Amino acid sequence: KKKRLTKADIGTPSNFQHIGHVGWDPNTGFDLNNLDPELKNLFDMCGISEAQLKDRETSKVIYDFIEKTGGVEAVKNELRRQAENLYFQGLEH
């Protein structure tokens, strides 16, 4: 039988709700409920305001830096290394 979505429907909006790439929307900025935790942690260490994350002009520049330096993956790996480093450095001989 007929598939409701045919080639003429390409690009039409989904009737479902979607997270968004790297939790970022290019008009509304970062969705703060579905932001990544480790990315948030990075942003807090940088003093970045919730209003700067939700601003279009500034969130783009954050988004773009994050893509520059190796995507969210590199950031995650970095906070993680830092945590296992902080694990061994809490040890007292």
Partner: protein
């Protein structure tokens, strides 16, 4: 906008309305490109379209794999594997082996609606709002792919998957990426096998660099509108696994 304080209201709303309808113009151009290309490639290049469609999907399954790989808690089994996730992982294998079966070893007549749905689940599912019902997603998709008229009954397979995946999604949310990766690795093997068996029936091999084109246009759509991408993904899927 005379006052200092109404001029900002005017400016902000001005901007909001414009850059919205501006981003709609963009999306529309990318859509119309992707539309004329796929339409032509279907109507001309016949089974090379099909062949590239698998690879565009195949590429999108691998992408959710590595994306969701980097959300998993510990690769180590830190306590007992909860019940809900064992049941979810098993449902992935069963619904996928059965979507494989409706298509390859049927009973008199091959049908691919089940393949199509779980493929959409595998690519599009990890992108859904955590609030979205996986049961509902799967139900909506058997209608969108035909299903209601088709003489196979899917209500058994959907409730297997929806039930299992939704139990994890609400009760053990941090374990969901574990299930998404499983779904993608099984789907990724399943697709690549369908691609290699459809290759056997006389074909231009390296002109399925279409794949790099579509996955370029689709990647542009995705950053503009994840939802629009998910819709045009399910359009591609609807042209696959049929006959």
């Amino acid at each position: 906008a005379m006052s200092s304080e109404v001029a900002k209201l005017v400016s902000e709303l001005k901007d909001a309305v414009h850059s919205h309808a501006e981003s709609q113009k963009v999306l529309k151009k990318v859509s119309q490109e992707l539309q004329t290309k796929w339409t032509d490639w279907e109507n001309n290049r016949g089974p090379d379209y099909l062949l590239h469609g698998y690879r565009v999907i195949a590429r999108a399954l691998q992408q959710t794999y590595t994306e969701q790989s980097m959300l998993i808690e510990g690769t180590s089994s830190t306590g007992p594997v909860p019940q809900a996730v064992t049941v979810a992982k098993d449902a992935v294998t069963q619904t996928v082996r059965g979507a494989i079966k409706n298509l390859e070893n049927p009973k008199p007549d091959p049908d691919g609606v089940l393949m199509q749905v779980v493929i959409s689940l595998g690519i599009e599912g990890p992108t859904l709002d955590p609030g979205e019902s996986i049961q509902n997603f799967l139900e909506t998709r058997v209608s969108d792919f035909g299903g209601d008229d088709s003489d196979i009954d899917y209500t058994s397979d959907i409730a297997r998957l929806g039930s299992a995946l939704d139990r994890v999604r609400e009760n053990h949310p941090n374990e969901m990426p574990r299930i998404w990766i499983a779904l993608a690795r099984e789907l990724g093997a399943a697709v690549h096998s369908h691609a290699t068996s459809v290759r056997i029936a006389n074909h231009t091999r390296d002109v399925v660099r279409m794949a790099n084109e579509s996955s370029r246009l689709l990647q542009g759509m995705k950053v503009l509108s994840v939802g629009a991408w998910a819709n045009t993904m399910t359009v591609l899927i609807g042209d696959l696994f049929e006959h």
